[PDB]
């Protein structure tokens, strides 16, 4: 089949900035390749068609060119509306492809997150299960690294994470971690904490509880 | 000037089947291509196959063949979409879309339709409070549910600054844990009630929780 890479896989800018998003086939698809555009919860939504064509009622500031491996698509100045992920698509071979997704996010100033731990309520443990909750609160960039810590010791296999769209008011991430194991596993242990790194952070910041 | 107007969400179990349709309202349905195409939770799109109705001619991709069979109805202009011998990694938002042969393009898409896979059974969520400290931070985790959504609101939704409801998380279970926060100010914690509501629509489950320190 014929395999689509876009790139960056990420952009950040700000509104009323140029984008510049690029899409590489494998081979040549001539002029027979499409962008979309796609938000949470909604189906994509056609910008460009063989290859620098717009679909009816798409916006003057979306625009595309290339031909044959390589590929554009240019947003002259980003609107609020245009932060989301596209994909490039082509048809000039079966089966039909997509791109892996660009996603254009809004840059802002490095914020540092606001760090909250959560025990497990007695009314769960009730149930024979201990989860333990991380919040990460408005922080930019989005990577973080959460770390959990048990009496000390690094915890691994155990915990699974969550991270909320870049918020439009304030354009910053939150990001949710759950540890859990079982009620005797959680009793026979004191300290649990959660260990955060960020680059709004000057060191690590750790927050814990004694059951 | 075309509608493509898919059916409801599906839950099925591994090794089973599922049939979807898309019904179109308006332009041509006979001089069209009908595609459907899928997508995982957060990843990315894939085409499935398609079929141009009035010669009743469908094509697949090859990971897919023997899988997927993709019929039409010109008579109700419906299109329909059936995966047989489901798994876990089948679990995705389906949708289909119009193909235009001239240029290689989808214009028309249609809702889409999500089909979770699973050996799960729908299963209401338990709702666990998760207390602020002694700007403060509470919220609720709503554990163990089955399947996807589930909503979260605070005070009736009359509170909506500050929240954050973070996407779900498949645990190994097979069954679905989210949580939902919100930051207040510490003032109000003395008097301001707190409560989480959670709905639960594929199990016409409605559960609130006050949340105190």
Redesign the interface.
């Known amino acids: 089949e014929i395999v689509l890479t876009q790139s960056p896989a990420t952009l950040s800018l700000s509104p009323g900035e140029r984008a510049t998003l690029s899409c590489r086939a494998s081979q040549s698809v001539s002029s027979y390749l499409a962008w979309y555009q796609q938000k949470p919860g909604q189906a994509p939504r056609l910008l460009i068609y063989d290859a620098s064509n717009r679909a009816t009622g798409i916006p003057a500031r979306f625009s595309g060119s290339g031909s044959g491996t390589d590929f554009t698509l240019t947003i002259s100045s980003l609107e609020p509306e245009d932060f989301a992920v596209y994909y490039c698509q082509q048809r000039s071979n079966w089966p039909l492809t997509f791109g892996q997704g660009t996603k254009v996010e809004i840059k802002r100033t490095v914020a540092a997150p606001s760090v909250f731990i959560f025990p497990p309520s007695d009314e769960q443990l009730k149930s024979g299960t201990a989860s333990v909750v991380c919040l990460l609160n408005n922080f930019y960039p989005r990577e973080a690294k959460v770390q959990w810590k048990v009496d000390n010791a690094l915890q691994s296999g155990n915990s699974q994470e969550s991270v909320t769209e870049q918020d439009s008011k304030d354009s910053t991430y939150s990001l949710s971690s759950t540890l859990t194991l079982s009620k005797a596993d959680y009793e026979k242990h004191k300290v649990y904490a959660c260990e955060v790194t960020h680059q709004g952070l000057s060191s690590p910041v750790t927050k814990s509880f004694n059951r | 000037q075309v509608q493509l107007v898919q059916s409801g969400a599906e839950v099925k179990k591994p090794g089973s089947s599922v049939k979807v349709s898309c019904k179109a309202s308006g332009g041509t349905f006979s001089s069209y291509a009908i ?1 459907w195409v899928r997508q995982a939770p957060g990843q ?4 499935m196959g ?1 079929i141009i109705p009035i010669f009743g001619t469908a ?1 697949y ?2 990971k897919f063949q023997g899988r997927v069979t993709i019929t039409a109805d010109e008579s109700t202009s419906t299109a329909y979409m059936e995966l047989s011998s489901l798994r876990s990694e089948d679990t995705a938002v389906y ?1 289909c ?1 119009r ?2 042969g001239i ?5 028309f ?4 339709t999500l089909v979770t896979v699973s050996s799960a059974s729908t299963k209401g969520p ?1 709702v ?4 602020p ?1 002694s ?1 403060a ?1 509470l ?1 609720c ?1 709503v ?1 163990d549910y089955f399947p996807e959504p589930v909503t979260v609101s605070w005070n009736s939704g009359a509170l909506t600054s500050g929240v ?6 498949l ?1 190994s279970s097979g069954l679905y ?3 939902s ?1 919100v ?1 207040v100010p510490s003032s109000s914690l003395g008097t301001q009630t707190y409560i989480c509501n959670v709905n639960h629509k594929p199990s016409n489950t409605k559960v609130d929780k006050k949340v105190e320190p």
């Open positions: 595609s990315g799109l894939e085409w398609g094509n991709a090859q949708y879309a193909y235009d240029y290689g393009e989808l214009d898409w249609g809702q889409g338990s666990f409070p998760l207390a400290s700007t931070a919220g985790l554990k954050h409801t973070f996407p779900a998380v645990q844990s989210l949580s926060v930051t």
